[PDB]
Each structure stands twice: as C-alpha cells, then as structure tokens.
Ligand binder design. Sequence first.
Ligand SMILES: CC(/C=C/C(=O)NO)=C\[C@@H](C)C(=O)c1ccc(N(C)C)cc1
Ligand SMILES: CC(/C=C/C(=O)NO)=C\[C@@H](C)C(=O)c1ccc(N(C)C)cc1
Ligand SMILES: [Ca+2]
Ligand SMILES: [Ca+2]
Ligand code: NA
Ligand code: NA
Ligand SMILES: [Zn+2]
Length: 364
Amino acid sequence: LVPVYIYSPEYVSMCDSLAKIPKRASMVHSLIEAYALHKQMRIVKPKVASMEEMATFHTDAYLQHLQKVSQEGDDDHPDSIEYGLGYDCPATEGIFDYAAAIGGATITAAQCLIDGMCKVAINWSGGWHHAKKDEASGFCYLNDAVLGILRLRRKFERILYVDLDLHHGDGVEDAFSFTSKVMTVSLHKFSPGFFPGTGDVSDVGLGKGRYYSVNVPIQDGIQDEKYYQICESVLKEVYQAFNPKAVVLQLGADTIAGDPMCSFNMTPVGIGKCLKYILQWQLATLILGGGGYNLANTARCWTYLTGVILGKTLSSEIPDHEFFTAYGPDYVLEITPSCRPDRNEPHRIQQILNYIKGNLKHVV
Ligand SMILES: CC(/C=C/C(=O)NO)=C\[C@@H](C)C(=O)c1ccc(N(C)C)cc1
Ligand SMILES: CC(/C=C/C(=O)NO)=C\[C@@H](C)C(=O)c1ccc(N(C)C)cc1
Ligand SMILES: [Ca+2]
Ligand SMILES: [Ca+2]
Ligand code: NA
Ligand code: NA
Ligand SMILES: [Zn+2]
C-alpha cells in the first residue's frame, strides 16, 4: 500500500559519482528527506544489476565496452564513438558501475511491483530512455526504463510506458517497436534539429508492434493546462484500447520552466495532474526520473510529485537541509512560468490528437 522508494546512501553516491556530470541525486533525495516523505514510504535498497540482467537488453559487446571504458579509459578506445560515447555520454571512470546501479535500482523497483510489495515504486535516479541495445545516447549509458519493463514482463503481460520527459523516449520506443506487448507513449518536443530528432506523430511502431507506439509532438512554451489536456486525451484513448497490466512512467523534469532546455513552460503541478490520472488506474506503476537540468527545480519537481503519489500537500517553504542555499533567493517549492509564448496552435494539437485516435483504433 505505501509506495516503495528506491534509495540507499550508496546508490545516491553512485548516481552522483561521475566526473563533470552534476550531483543531482543527493539534491533530490535530500529535499524529499527534508519534507520527511521517506518516512511515508517503504525504503528499499537497490540491488546492483548483474551483467546477465543488463544483457537482458544490452548486447554483450556494448556492455563489455562500457566495462572497459569504465575501468581504464576516457580516450584511447577505437570503438567508443560508434558505441555512442562522447559529449552527451562522456567516457569517464565508473560509468559501468553507475549504469549497473541505475539499471539495478529500476529492476529492484519492478521486482517490488511484481511481488505486490507496493502499487507504486519510485526510482528518481532512473528513466534514462535514450540508450539502445548497443549504443549510449543523451546521458544514457544503460536503458534502465527498458530493463524495468522487461522485469515487469516476467509477471504482467502488457506494459504501458509513458514518457513525459521533454525528449522523445526513442530508446524505449525502439526496444519495443516490434511488439504489441509493450505500448510506448511519448510526449516530447519535436522540432527540426531538436534532440534526438525522432518521434513524429506518424511513428507508430513496426510489424506486430504497428500502432503500439504513440508519439505526441509538442512545440515550445506549452504550459500546465494545455499539456494536461493533451496528456489526458491521449492516455484516456490509450488505456481503453490497450488495457495495460502495469505502467512505467518516466517523468523527466526538463519540461519545467527555468530548465536550460528552455523549451516547455511547465510546472510540477501540470506534470502532477498527469501522474494523478495514471495513478487513478491503480495499476502497478514504476516511477522514473530522467532529464532535469535546473537541479533545484528538478528536486522541487520530483519532491512535489512524491507528495502527489503520497496524497500529501507539501509546505511551500523549503525546509532547512544540506542544499538549502540552492533554493534561494525565494526558498519556495513552487515554480513560476517564464514569460514565453506558447507555440502550440490549438488546430495542430487537435490534428495530432485525431491522428493518434485513428491509430489507436487498430489496437489491438
Ligand atoms: C543530450 C541532451 C538531453 C537529453 C535528455 O534530457 N534526455 O531526455 C541534451 C543535449 C542536446 C544538450 O543540450 C547538452 C547540453 C550539455 C551537455 N554537456 C554539458 C555534456 C550535453 C548535452
Ligand atoms: C544538459 C545540461 C546543461 C545544458 C545547458 O544548456 N546549460 O547551459 C547539463 C547536464 C550535463 C546536466 O546537468 C546533467 C545532470 C544530471 C545527469 N544525470 C543524472 C545523468 C546528466 C546531465
Ligand atoms: Ca542479450
Ligand atoms: Ca509469456
Ligand atoms: Na517524452
Ligand atoms: Na510496442
Ligand atoms: Zn530529456
């Protein structure tokens, strides 16, 4: 009944251990702990993913490469560019243990769901949706979202994956594009030159998986009310057509106003309405983080969302804690909307929604 919270001091240290990658995990946990929300949850220490468990999705060659680079390298390896390592996925020591930790945490969350320990299990340090079987991409060395889905698939026949990160969940979609057993639904920015470039409304999966991928392309500057209307429209149609047995929900906070991504104009309240809608299905739900690069804002967001999972309304005052100064100058939980135009034309949104509805008529 109480949500599972995947946490250990070791796990947070590991998630924060990569050189030059900013130290977000501790900020997120510390804020949740400052609000004492961990006391309302079942704190579960994550296992570390074994080679075999990561190999459920990732190829041997890619994993072995990740391990070699994690030990000795940064440069000096011929295969690293092809394996996707570089600027947005740096080759630095510990990347393999980092990946193992996050993969293991999400799998642990899934296992908790399978065992009926909880109906909601949270890994705020996961959601790394871009990684492919054989390739790192966009901060994702390992696709823990895919690993979570595959773990859930041990018990639950049909999984719905919902990706509310600013970016297209291409790695997860690709993993499951050829099957009807997993439906992926991604809302994301879709614009010429915008990472990773994929996820147009016309991308619907392939083969046995045709029409079991859903992509919702959204433009800059969308705010809470409009986003939720879109999200609810699509998810209502998805739930009725697909009838998921479990849900994996990726809640990247890079949609939030003030993010360096400077794209969407959301607040945690808007994302929270989407979360509430999904939670109301009362299915086993695995909650992941993802992007989120205004670190304080991301902690504000996921803390707030932890609150909605718990059905609690949190104080607007940020409580004193380790990273309190990071919340200045206002020291409040709430995020303001930037003064930025909403580039989403109602008519285009309706067209997109009509198209998805047409597609979902083939499900399933
Ligand atoms: C990869 C990504 C986000 C993905 C995501 O959020 N997945 O959902 C954004 C790219 C476009 C980017 O802007 C960037 C910025 C800085 C940087 N370093 C400082 C190393 C590396 C990449
Ligand atoms: C995207 C960005 C800034 C872009 C910009 O445009 N800045 O101006 C910075 C990245 C490095 C970042 O902050 C980050 C944090 C955590 C993380 N993981 C927990 C995997 C991966 C990346
Ligand atoms: Ca394999
Ligand atoms: Ca089977
Ligand atoms: Na997304
Ligand atoms: Na699919
Ligand atoms: Zn993102």
